[PDB]
Design an enzyme around this catalytic site. Sequence first.
Site, PDB file in Angstrom:
ATOM      1  N   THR A   1      20.208 -73.046  39.908  1.00  0.00           N
ATOM      2  CA  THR A   1      21.185 -73.829  39.158  1.00  0.00           C
ATOM      3  C   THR A   1      21.730 -74.981  39.997  1.00  0.00           C
ATOM      4  OG1 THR A   1      21.855 -71.748  38.097  1.00  0.00           O
ATOM      5  CG2 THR A   1      23.191 -73.702  37.647  1.00  0.00           C
TER       6      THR A   1
ATOM      7  N   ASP B   1      22.830 -78.202  35.197  1.00  0.00           N
ATOM      8  CA  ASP B   1      21.453 -78.287  34.724  1.00  0.00           C
ATOM      9  C   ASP B   1      21.228 -77.173  33.710  1.00  0.00           C
ATOM     10  OD1 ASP B   1      21.434 -76.195  36.780  1.00  0.00           O
ATOM     11  OD2 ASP B   1      19.248 -76.245  36.557  1.00  0.00           O
TER      12      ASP B   1
ATOM     13  N   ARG C   1      18.134 -75.019  33.841  1.00  0.00           N
ATOM     14  CA  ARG C   1      17.010 -74.178  34.241  1.00  0.00           C
ATOM     15  C   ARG C   1      17.446 -72.772  34.638  1.00  0.00           C
ATOM     16  NH1 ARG C   1      12.764 -76.378  38.554  1.00  0.00           N
ATOM     17  NH2 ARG C   1      11.931 -77.344  36.646  1.00  0.00           N
TER      18      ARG C   1
ATOM     19  N   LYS D   1      25.005 -73.575  30.790  1.00  0.00           N
ATOM     20  CA  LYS D   1      25.704 -73.032  31.948  1.00  0.00           C
ATOM     21  C   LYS D   1      27.159 -73.478  31.993  1.00  0.00           C
ATOM     22  CE  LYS D   1      21.403 -73.103  34.599  1.00  0.00           C
ATOM     23  NZ  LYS D   1      20.723 -73.557  35.847  1.00  0.00           N
TER      24      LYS D   1
ATOM     25  N   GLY E   1      24.392 -68.502  39.625  1.00  0.00           N
ATOM     26  CA  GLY E   1      24.167 -67.220  40.265  1.00  0.00           C
ATOM     27  C   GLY E   1      23.484 -66.223  39.351  1.00  0.00           C
TER      28      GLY E   1
ATOM     29  N   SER F   1      22.058 -73.462  43.858  1.00  0.00           N
ATOM     30  CA  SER F   1      20.991 -73.722  44.813  1.00  0.00           C
ATOM     31  C   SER F   1      20.820 -75.218  45.096  1.00  0.00           C
ATOM     32  CB  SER F   1      19.674 -73.129  44.310  1.00  0.00           C
ATOM     33  OG  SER F   1      19.283 -73.721  43.083  1.00  0.00           O
TER      34      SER F   1
ATOM     35  N   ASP G   1      15.966 -79.800  44.161  1.00  0.00           N
ATOM     36  CA  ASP G   1      15.975 -78.344  44.274  1.00  0.00           C
ATOM     37  C   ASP G   1      15.004 -77.679  43.297  1.00  0.00           C
ATOM     38  OD1 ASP G   1      16.725 -75.630  44.802  1.00  0.00           O
ATOM     39  OD2 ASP G   1      18.174 -75.739  43.160  1.00  0.00           O
TER      40      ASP G   1
ATOM     41  N   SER H   1      16.561 -75.840  40.343  1.00  0.00           N
ATOM     42  CA  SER H   1      17.136 -76.582  39.226  1.00  0.00           C
ATOM     43  C   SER H   1      16.066 -77.370  38.477  1.00  0.00           C
ATOM     44  CB  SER H   1      18.236 -77.524  39.717  1.00  0.00           C
ATOM     45  OG  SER H   1      18.943 -76.960  40.807  1.00  0.00           O
TER      46      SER H   1
END
Lengths: 238, 204, 220, 234, 202, 245, 244, 233
Positions: free
Chosen positions: C1, C17, C19, C33, C47, C129, C166, C169
């Site tokens: 995330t 995001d 994902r 999210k 998380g 992340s 990342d 994400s």
Amino acid sequence: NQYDNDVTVWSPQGRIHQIEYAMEAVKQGSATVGLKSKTHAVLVALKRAQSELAAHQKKILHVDNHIGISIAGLTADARLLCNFMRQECLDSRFVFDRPLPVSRLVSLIGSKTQIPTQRYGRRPYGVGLLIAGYDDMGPHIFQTCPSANYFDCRAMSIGARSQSARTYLERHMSEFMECNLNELVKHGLRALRETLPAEQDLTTKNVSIGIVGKDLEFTIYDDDDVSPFLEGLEERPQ
Amino acid sequence: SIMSYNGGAVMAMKGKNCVAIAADRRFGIQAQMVTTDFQKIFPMGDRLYIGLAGLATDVQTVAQRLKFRLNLYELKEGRQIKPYTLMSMVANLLYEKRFGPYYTEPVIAGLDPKTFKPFICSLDLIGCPMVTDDFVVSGTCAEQMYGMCESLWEPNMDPDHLFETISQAMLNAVDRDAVSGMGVIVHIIEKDKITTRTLKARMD
Amino acid sequence: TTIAGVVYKDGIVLGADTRATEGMVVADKNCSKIHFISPNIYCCGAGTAADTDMTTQLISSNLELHSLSTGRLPRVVTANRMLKQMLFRYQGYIGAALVLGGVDVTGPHLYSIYPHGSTDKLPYVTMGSGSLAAMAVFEDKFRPDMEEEEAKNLVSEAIAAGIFNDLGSGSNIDLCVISKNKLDFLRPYTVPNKKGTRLGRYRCEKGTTAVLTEKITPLE
Amino acid sequence: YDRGVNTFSPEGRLFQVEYAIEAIKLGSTAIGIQTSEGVCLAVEKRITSPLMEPSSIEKIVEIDAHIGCAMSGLIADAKTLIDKARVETQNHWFTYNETMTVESVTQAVSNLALQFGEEDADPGAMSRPFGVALLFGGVDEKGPQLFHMDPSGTFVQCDARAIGSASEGAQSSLQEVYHKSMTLKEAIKSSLIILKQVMEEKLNATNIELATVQPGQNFHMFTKEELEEVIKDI
Amino acid sequence: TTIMAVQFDGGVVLGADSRTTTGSYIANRVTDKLTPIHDRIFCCRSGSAADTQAVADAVTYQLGFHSIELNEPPLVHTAASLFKEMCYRYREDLMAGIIIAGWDPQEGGQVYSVPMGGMMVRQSFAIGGSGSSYIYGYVDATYREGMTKEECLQFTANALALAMERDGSSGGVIRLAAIAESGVERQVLLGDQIPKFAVATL
Amino acid sequence: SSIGTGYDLSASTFSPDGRVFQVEYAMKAVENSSTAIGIRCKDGVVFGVEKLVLSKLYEEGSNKRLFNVDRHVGMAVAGLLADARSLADIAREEASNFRSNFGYNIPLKHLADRVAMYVHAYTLYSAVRPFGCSFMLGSYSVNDGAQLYMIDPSGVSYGYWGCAIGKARQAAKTEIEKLQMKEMTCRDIVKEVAKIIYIVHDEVKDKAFELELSWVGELTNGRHEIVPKDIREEAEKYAKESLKE
Amino acid sequence: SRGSSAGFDRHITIFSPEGRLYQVEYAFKAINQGGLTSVAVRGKDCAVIVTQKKVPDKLLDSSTVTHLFKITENIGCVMTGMTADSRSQVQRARYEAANWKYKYGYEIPVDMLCKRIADISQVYTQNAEMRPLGCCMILIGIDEEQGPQVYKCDPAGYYCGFKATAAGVKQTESTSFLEKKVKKKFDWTFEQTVETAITCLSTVLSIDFKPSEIEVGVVTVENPKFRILTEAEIDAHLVALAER
Amino acid sequence: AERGYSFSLTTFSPSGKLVQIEYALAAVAGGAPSVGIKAANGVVLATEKKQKSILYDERSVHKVEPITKHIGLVYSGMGPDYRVLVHRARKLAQQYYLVYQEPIPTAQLVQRVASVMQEYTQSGGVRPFGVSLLICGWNEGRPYLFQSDPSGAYFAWKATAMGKNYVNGKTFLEKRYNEDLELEDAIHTAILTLKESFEGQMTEDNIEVGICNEAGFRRLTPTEVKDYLAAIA
Ligand SMILES: *[C@](O)([C@H](C)CO)[C@H](CC(C)C)NC(=O)[C@H](Cc1ccccc1)NC(=O)[C@H](CC(C)C)NC(=O)[C@H](CCc1ccccc1)NC(=O)CN1CCOCC1
Ligand SMILES: CC(C)C[C@H](NC(=O)[C@H](CCc1ccccc1)NC(=O)CN1CCOCC1)C(=O)N[C@@H](Cc1ccccc1)C(=O)N[C@@H](CC(C)C)[C@@H](O)[C@H](C)CO
């Protein structure tokens, strides 16, 4: 009549009838005497018998090497309280390796016995106690009532017709502090025998003695071991 | 892996006014097959199916407890259950065991009992919901199933194209996995009827 | 995330995001999210998915009860306290990193809440992340008292950095603007990533799938 | 007018306990006699029907190989006490590798005396006293011993004792014939005589039960034949 | 982290860095480590952020109720004692190094240390946190009894500056708080305000 | 002021005129007890108790109605003695807990508050009965001062300069009012306490009595102690002599 | 009906044939047993409490005799009725407030505090094991947006916000006074509020107090901290009244 | 120390009547009147919010309470009991939502709250609630009006009244009102049926009205009540 059946009910006169009714249980048992010199504490108890074929009821119980008691009232409650005192003494020895001061044990008896006099559905302990003990404050005679009140005594008597014994002791208080052991037990036996009509007197079959002191652990003399105390007494009057 | 102990595969696909759900038929312990007719898809009412992949015991247990709560729901309330509602129910049931989870990843496929609007979702072992408009997969061969679905699925499929699509996806994904297979079953459900077929598949 | 949050002149911008992964495989290409707490308070979750979900839902519920009894609009400090105390009571076993943003009777408030129960009140925060990239964008291009569109641009930029840099994400950028008198829950604020168009027709025509058993069942 | 089960009378006694003592007076009368050759316990069975199997009426039971017990009153209450006694003896054997003194057993059972109450108590705790009276006859290191216990929990040793409906009369008759030197045969004989006196039914071999515990022999329940052979010399 | 508290005549001076790290990453380069427990009672936090925050909250709660129930300004020793009780009772579950300091009408300016053990001791001055290791010598050679308020201020400023310079887990900004009967004077030393020292060249 | 048709059998039951007769009955139990007084001077608090003697067989100092609740706090009781002792236990435990939690000697006002709350907790249910006693807590400190509080069976707690509880409560209060304890010292006060005790005592109805006395002040470093035999016999002499006028 | 009874409906908290709770009403009568009266008045920029201070003994440290209690720095209260019950309810209030701030991170509203206390009282109203408290609580304090707040809660479980109220013996007379004084619509300043309260109590008791006969709690918008007036600054208002 | 009475305070009389529940209803039929009207496109709840002085602040405590965003409450009987039931109802609703992620059906909330009320007619050491509840809601397109009495029983109403003169109000609604009404009309006949027992100048502060359409539940502002109480608008 409406304030009679519960220990949580105050009377309009500021009294608790269940407590007093419990106090009456002490007078239902056979009389007992306790007195102390300056070196010894002595309990003398008049054992009672149902019939002549039944042995006499135990009245003196061992608590610790330095503490013994004499009961007056419900024997079940007596056994309960006794086991409690025994347990507290054992705890004291386990934790501190020194014998429990008698006054503190009595205080604990007060604290324990006070609790059920304030809770609904509970009842006071129907038993009075005479506690003879010895510690580094000397000998001690204590008295505990169903009302959870306790007294430090020079001499005391509780139970049936114990008024005579009380009247006797109250005259010889001054003598008590200097008597030797035999004289002390003598006085105890006279006080005890005062609670009897002249048609009956003390016998080896109906008298028990408990002795504790600076030179002696708490010991109980019951039958043939009582004779050295009885044999050496006046003939009494009529 | 605990999930891989029994193996298995479950997939669901969306259609025009229809929906599809398929699963392999193998009940095996690690490397040995015990049964070839193991049910992994259970009807939670008319036009609403659930498919559980993972540890067989937890598949059966989650199915049973879910039927318990469902029956109680459709009794307390005078209605059949909505797909979203069933999803939240499963999510709750799984999350109640957050720190001792059932090892199964459920996949719900059905049609709205009031409307007819198609519905497909999947969940974690701890009950995290995920709703999609195309397909959902869960099993030991999830990557293969993703591979097939990402290349075969078209939007508005009729009840015949949907069947062919989900069937080819399941067959060809499962055929690249050792612990999934021994037959494939497909339920294609629409407003009027429900059609259940078992495909011709490899048995090795 | 890759969730972020910023505080500007009139309120707060929240970004995230979409994902969701299991293993090193994308499980959800479009996952919301940014969660509803109260009509004036939203919270981004990163998380353990189920944990962020159930936690944010529970606190939302408790806040609804709270405001229902108080008759006033919920404060952000309340959601922060509830979240941090619950999370701390579980000693990090609830994998929930959160970005809590909202407008109060006291103004705009932005907190970051780590799964162990610690919180930080800052003008701008990032979690996930991809939080380092986003935080780099913030540290590079943040100024106090930004205008709404400026802040939206900044946050979307941060989330974008998370998305492309990342591996955790990916996909869309969701925003949530919260001012003293507006709530813009812009869903697909940007779709910077698109699936390539199919170059072939792998459509299977009716009949190519062999069948062993069939059973039709009529309904109603 | 209802009151608590732990209420005191103005006289200084517990109502429920006194009422239990009153309850004993309706039970089958039993007699226990202590003798240097052993202890004996006899009790009438009070068969209320010819159809009732008399061998299913046991008011004398074995606590342990060296201790037997006779009961009077509400027998159902006594069963619990008996089992508690047996369990106590076995626990003591397990722990100390020795037999319990009769007095210790009697005391142990007597500890369940006023273990009743309402508030501030366990869910399974007793609601009322045990309406039963017990005679513990056994042989230990102090020789033959006989004890008596009533619902008050007061237990005391007796040389000869009668409990039950015909308590007073049987006790008088006991006082008339007891000297601390009887033989066991004399004790059994006297017991059966007084029993025959106080019983309303004709004393026979199926009307009562008698048991002895002696220094050399375990707890022995008298069979029909032995009972007959004692009733013989009526 | 790196905390500090020095006692002068009419009160105390508190100081802390502002760096909060997870791993080698700085999750907050501007932390507020000086936490108010009461009107004139502050505490300096070091160790686990979650732990110290939770404990600080709880102690603020308890001490608030206690001071209300007594209707008197809470003794600093009392706050320190609440912290002490919590940190000692849960010593195996908490990672907390605390310095409770403040003013009190009965004992004046007081500084107490509650290290990870759970023990408690009053000190003329106290330092804690990872950076404290690098300033033990300086703080030993620089301390002088009878320091003025401003002298203590400059003192903690310098010490914290040095520690922050050496310790990687410490840095960011310097937060200072002056507590006396007057009240609480908080300030922030940033950039060129932070004391600098001659770095070796050739 | 006398209703009792079932409305007086519980503390969980109000009277139709808004009274809790069980508490009042307990207070009457306090009234039937021997009088105990306590007075605060500028440099501490002094306690005096009329300890009636029920028998010459009892040792001296038996049935103490003066307790050490804490090393800096003394307690004077009036009424049902067992309850008073249990309450002394509760007070002691409260002080101990306070020390173990906060690290210093418990302030008297707070101790009185806590114990009073505990007492009040018994004036509300049918499961328990109100305590049958009233008591006074005395203490001294340099940072706190001299303090004397009193608690009745209802749970009411108040701060006094002078106070009395028992049979001749009012008869003692009228005698205490004559004193100027705001200027006097605990040294002078003891005599006056013994005096008021002897005055209030009824030598006719009540038999022989023993007098108990207690210090707590600057003269004792803040420690609550028993009055030495010298000062006690001095005060008793002053009292017996002042009784001839 | 009309006064009917059946069973133990006069002994415990169960319904009478006409649907009343006699024990509750009895508790309301128990409030008056103290023989005191308290008055609360809400101003435009403040809130004021005034209460009798009957100290009939010079043996009492008159500083310990109070019916005014600080619940929070910004929330004050006055208790009317049975003293011990009152102190109990004050303790509970303090707990609920402190706990509120601990859990939610902001000071509890007077509204919510009073509501909570009343909710606790309701249980005593519905359970037979305990008896309601013979006291009435009046809370005052400044609210962030709604400004000055004066709330009151009963043994019945009733709670409400007020422009003004009273409690105790002369409650009805004081209310009849206060509504008459409110209808006139004056400029509710600080002194206007304090004077209105003190004069309400005074003309309701016909006493004309000394500055040591009453106690006055207060809370201003400019100074939200619950403040208790000294004898001097009460005597100031007292002499300020005997001029017009 | 305390525990609790474990025995029922509500028992059967020889005639077969749960007397305490009936007395509870006696308490209910004694409080301020409340009317509720279901109206095809919405529901209306209305009650007499008549204080007892000018000193009371009517904008602090409310009789018309929201349970959720789509369910509302009014009552007849005892205030505190009602308050308790409101808190409990809100909690139940939140539980349902946490489990199903869907707003609780009005009928379900009614049933659950009814179970809660039922408990207090059998559980130990407690009296029943002296409260009848009118519960309005908007679920699955259709509007809903329910009533729950102290016994824990519940009924669905097209329109009804509770409290003082509930019989006259019931006949009034039975006559001067019917289906196919709009929300406005329903509010009108609700204030009208409330006026049939308003012994005084019925202001906008003397009564409280809440509405529940398919756009949610809310309490009408004093201004809107003023517009309606102009015998028009
Ligand atoms: C201070 O002491 C100085 C700077 C030196 O450390 C500071 C100041 C305080 C008051 C904030 N303390 C820290 O910076 C502190 C160190 C610490 C680590 C672990 C346990 C206890 C203390 N940092 C944190 O507490 C930090 C808080 C926020 C995230 C900002 N969280 C952590 O350090 C994680 C602790 C959770 C945990 C992990 C394993 C077992 C039990 C509990 N540690 C992580 O590694 C978090 N995480 C996973 C790994 O990759 C990075 C993110
Ligand atoms: C696929 C979706 C519906 C959910 C996905 N779920 C999962 O991955 C769950 C995890 C369940 C779990 C149990 C115990 C303890 C922790 C977690 N796994 C399973 O459901 C099945 N498996 C069982 C055995 O094989 C591996 C996984 C997930 O949580 N993904 C996380 C990443 C993660 C972190 C820690 C543990 C497990 C997973 C995620 O997307 N997080 C994003 C934030 C969102 C979702 C709020 C981000 O953080 C971005 C995408 C980076 O991952």
